[PDB]
Amino acid sequence: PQAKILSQAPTELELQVAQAFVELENSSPELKAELRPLQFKSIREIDVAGGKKALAIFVPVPSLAGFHKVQTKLTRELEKKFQDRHVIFLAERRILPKPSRTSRQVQKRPRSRTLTAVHDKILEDLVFPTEIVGKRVRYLVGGNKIQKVLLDSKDVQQIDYKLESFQAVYNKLTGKQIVFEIPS
RNA sequence: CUUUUACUUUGAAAAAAUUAGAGUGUUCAAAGCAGGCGUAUUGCUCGAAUAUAUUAGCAUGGAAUAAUAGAAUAGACGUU
Numbered sequence: 001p002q003a004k005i006l007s008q009a010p011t012e013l014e015l016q017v018a019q020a021f022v023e024l025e026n027s028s029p030e031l032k033a034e035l036r037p038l039q040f041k042s043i044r045e046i047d048v049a050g051g052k053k054a055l056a057i058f059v060p061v062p063s064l065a066g067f068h069k070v071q072t073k074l075t076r077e078l079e080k081k082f083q084d085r086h087v088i089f090l091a092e093r094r095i096l097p098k099p100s101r102t103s104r105q106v107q108k109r110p111r112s113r114t115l116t117a118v119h120d121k122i123l124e125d126l127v128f129p130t131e132i133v134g135k136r137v138r139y140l141v142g143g144n145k146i147q148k149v150l151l152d153s154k155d156v157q158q159i160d161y162k163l164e165s166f167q168a169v170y171n172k173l174t175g176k177q178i179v180f181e182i183p184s
Numbered sequence: 185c186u187u188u189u190a191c192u193u194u195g196a197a198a199a200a201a202u203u204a205g206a207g208u209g210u211u212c213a214a215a216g217c218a219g220g221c222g223u224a225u226u227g228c229u230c231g232a233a234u235a236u237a238u239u240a241g242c243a244u245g246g247a248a249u250a251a252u253a254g255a256a257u258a259g260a261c262g263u264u
Contacts, residue, residue: 106258
């Protein structure tokens with residue numbers, strides 16, 4: 001098939017990932033049916049505190065729909081087909097600098113194309129099935145900076161455990177300090 | 185080709201008399217621009233200041249304060 005479902009050209013970790021995708025449409029019917037056209041960019045490993053990895057997907061963009069359609073299954077077959085591993089879903093979003101003064105016009109920025117936006121989206125798609133409820137942020141005497149993130153108290157089992165990892169994955173990408181809370 | 189301002193530094197350019205002020209015994213002082221010594225038998229000299237003198241304008245170092253300007257139907261450098 002699979003090099004296909006890679007969306008670049010190169011490639012070491014991806015082709016096993018492509019393989020395990022072209023394996024579920026091979027093995028599971030119900031699963032080809034949705035999965036067949038769902039293309040991706042590249043992957044990035046990222047380490048977490050207690051030994052345990054985390055499997056960093058990056059999305060073309062459009063299907064974030066496609067992908068959300070069958071995530072809450074897809075991951076579960078993948079977490080088994082890869083160990084330790086945390087598989088995630090997030091999009092690659094064309095951030096931009098602010099126009100300086102000697103700068104330029106180009107055309108704009110389209111708000112949602114700004115550092116915080118993207119960082120808000122990075123949110124929605126670090127968790128996903130839970131839905132964000134409530135945000136909160138700290139400011140400590142060493143200008144800390146800490147987001148509390150508020151969660152809904154329903155489906156946090158989809159995955160809890162993750163969590164220890166989540167904090168990290170939102171750290172390499174950004175250089176930040178993230179926490180959660182289950183409210184009662 | 186080098187946005188612009190105010191503000192501030194200095195510095196000059198600046199009329200003396202006045203005003204402040206150094207000298208100096210008009211006998212003192214108010215003054216004044218004088219006086220001082222010798223071989224006072226025939227020649228020597230010290231000076232006659234500084235400073236204030238603002239408001240406008242120049243030249244000037246400051247770059248805090250307070251304004252203002254560059255680029256959001258697109259500009260900035262350019263090796264092509």
